[PDB]
Amino acid sequence: LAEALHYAL
Ligand SMILES: [Co+2]
């Protein structure tokens, strides 16, 4: 989750 989110952002 944490990194999926950083990527998306
Ligand atoms: Co990150």
Helical residues (DSSP H) of 1-9, grouped into ranges: 2-8
Cα 3 to middle of ligand 1, angstroms: 5
Tokens of 8: 């998306």
Cα 2 to middle of ligand 1, angstroms: 7
Quick one: resolution in A? 0.8
Cα 1 to middle of ligand 1, angstroms: 10
Cα 8 to middle of ligand 1, angstroms: 10
Residues, the chain, total? 9
What technique solved it?
X-ray
Cα 5 to middle of ligand 1, angstroms: 8
* Radius of gyration for the chain, computed over Cα atoms and rounded to the nearest angstrom: 5
